[PDB]
A and B are shown apart, each in its own frame.
Chain A
C-alpha cells in the first residue's frame, strides 16, 4: 500500500 503530501 501507498499513501501519496505531508
Chain B
C-alpha cells in the first residue's frame, strides 16, 4: 500500500499548499492543508456555521454511507496563528492519492475563525504530527498517517514542496527519483509531539558556516522560516535597507534588493535556500517594501522550519519506532 498526491500552492507567494483528499462514500473531494505541526483532520462541513463558510467545499456527512457520528466526541484546536476551529466528530473512509483509510476520525467544524473563513482555497487541515497532539475528547483520536502506517510498505511519507509550482506527498515509499545525492537522516524528539529536530548550524550567503545547534520543528503548516533573533539578525544585516518594523511586525527589505541564500545544516550536510524563496513580495499592494521569509522566533518560543526551508529540500518523515527526519537536495 502506497499513495502519491499532488500538492499545489494556493497563491503566487506559496503561503500554503493544498492536496486533494477523498472523504466518504461515495467520495467528496476536499482540498486540505497537510500540516505536519498539528494532529487533527478537520474539514468545513454541513454543520459549519453558514456565516463562516465563503467559497469553501463542505463535507456533507449525511451523504456519506460510510459516515458515522462519534457520539459525545468533540474537538477544539488553536494555532500559533491564533487561528481557531472546533466542533464534533465523525468516522469515515478517507483516501489520499489512492491510499485508503477506513474509520478515520474526521472532525467536522461547527465553528471556524475569521482566518479560515477568509481563506477560500482551504477546505480544512490534515495533521501529520504525532497523535498525542490530537485534540478530540474524551477519546483522543489518531492521525491519518498513524492509521496507514501498518498498511504501508514503509511507515513513511515524504514532502517535496515546489517553489511557485506543484509538488508531491508520497506515503509508503521514497522516490529515489525526486532528490539529488544522499538523504541525511537526523534524530527526532517526539517529546512535545512535533517532528522536532536539531540543526547543526547556518551560513548566510557565501559566508562562513557557524556551527550552532538550532532546535525547531519541521512544519509544512507554516509559511515562513522562524529562527532565533541572533541568526535572523545576521541574515538581514547582509541586505541593504532591511530593518525590523514595529508597524508591519517583522523584517522588511526594499523590493529592489538582492536576497542572499540561507544555508542550514543537517548533520554534516547543508541545504541552501535560494535567496528567491525568501522574498514574499510587497508588504502591501503598490509598496516598494517587501516582506522577508526569515523572521525571528523570539515571540513563539519555538523555531519553525516552515515551507520556506522545506521547499528547498526533499524531506522524509520516517515514522518508525525510532522516528527520523531525512533531508536531501533537489
Binary contact readout B255-289 vs A (1 if CB under 8 angstroms, 0 otherwise): 00000000000000000000000001000000000
Binding site secondary structure of chain A:
loop
Binary contact readout B80-97 vs A (1 if CB under 8 angstroms, 0 otherwise): 110100000000000000
Residues of A within 8 A of B38 (CB): 4-5
Return the contact of A4 from the options B133, B222, B280 (Cβ within 8 A): B222
By the criterion CB–CB under 8 Å, are B223 and A6 in contact? Answer: no
By the criterion CB–CB under 8 Å, are A3 and B78 in contact? Answer: no
Binary contact readout B301-320 vs A (1 if CB under 8 angstroms, 0 otherwise): 00010110000000000000
- Apart from A4-B34, A4-B35, A6-B78, what are 7 other A-B pairs with CB-CB below 8 Å? A1-B222, A2-B16, A3-B80, A3-B219, A4-B306, A5-B37, A5-B129
By the criterion CB–CB under 8 Å, are B81 and A2 in contact? Answer: yes
A-B contact count (CB 8 A): 57
By the criterion CB–CB under 8 Å, are A4 and B219 in contact? Answer: yes
Residues of A within 8 A of B133 (CB): 5
Binding site secondary structure of chain B:
loop
Closest to B77 in A: A5
Residues of A within 8 A of B45 (CB): none
Residues of B within 8 A of A6 (CB): 78-80
16 A–B contacts from the bound complex (CB under 8 Å): A2-B115, A2-B221, A2-B222, A3-B83, A3-B219, A3-B224, A4-B36, A4-B222, A5-B37, A5-B38, A5-B39, A5-B40, A5-B80, A5-B193, A6-B79, A6-B80
Closest to B300 in A: A3
Residues of A within 8 A of B153 (CB): none
By the criterion CB–CB under 8 Å, are A3 and B79 in contact? Answer: yes
By the criterion CB–CB under 8 Å, are B223 and A5 in contact? Answer: no
**B199 located at the interface, meaning its Cβ lies under 8 Å from any Cβ of chain A in the complex:** no
Question: Nearest Cβ distance between residue A4 and chain B, in whole angstroms?
Answer: 1
Taken together as a complex, chains A and B put the C-alpha atoms of A6 and B222 apart, in Å, by 13
Taken together as a complex, chains A and B put the C-alpha atoms of A4 and B77 apart, in Å, by 10
Question: Nearest Cβ distance between residue A1 and chain B, in whole angstroms?
Answer: 4
